[PDB]
Amino acid sequence: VQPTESIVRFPNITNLCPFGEVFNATRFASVYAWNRKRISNCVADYSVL
Amino acid sequence: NVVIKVCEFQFCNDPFLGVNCTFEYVS
Ligand SMILES: *[C@@H]1O[C@H](CO)[C@@H](O)[C@H](O)[C@H]1NC(C)=O
Numbered sequence: 001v002q003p004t005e006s007i008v009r010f011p012n013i014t015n016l017c018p019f020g021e022v023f024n025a026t027r028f029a030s031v032y033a034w035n036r037k038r039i040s041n042c043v044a045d046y047s048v049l
Numbered sequence: 050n051v052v053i054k055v056c057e058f059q060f061c062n063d064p065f066l067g068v069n070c071t072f073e074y075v076s
């Protein structure tokens with residue numbers, strides 16, 4: 001018997017790793033010194049931008 | 050909670066809690 005369709009399950013997308021603040025923050029800094037980023041865990045990225 | 054951090058820190062000669070972090074977590 002052949003597979004009638006494919007099925008995929010990965011858990012509830014949860015740690016959207018935060019692009020929100022890096023593109024919402026009122027106080028964007030001047031050229032010289034700005035901000036920075038780090039990674040925790042899970043899947044965030046998406047494609048909102 | 051359980052609370053966790055990876056912070057590069059200068060601990061004491063006898064570090065305790067009373068009676069620069071690239072990661073952190075809580076449970
Ligand atoms: C900034 O916040 C607005 C909602 O107030 C949101 O629609 C927008 O996508 C945010 N920008 C980013 C990408 O952080």
Ligand SMILES: *[C@@H]1O[C@H](CO)[C@@H](O)[C@H](O)[C@H]1NC(C)=O
Nearest residue numbers: 050051052053066067075076
């Ligand atoms: C106890 O853990 C919580 C985790 O949310 C934290 O908010 C709080 O500052 C911690 N307090 C101490 C004394 O470690």
Ligand SMILES: *[C@@H]1O[C@H](CO)[C@@H](O)[C@H](O)[C@H]1NC(C)=O
Nearest residue numbers: 055056057058059069070071
């Ligand atoms: C904080 O961590 C960065 C990692 O590159 C290091 O350059 C800096 O000297 C550290 N500062 C302190 C006070 O731990």
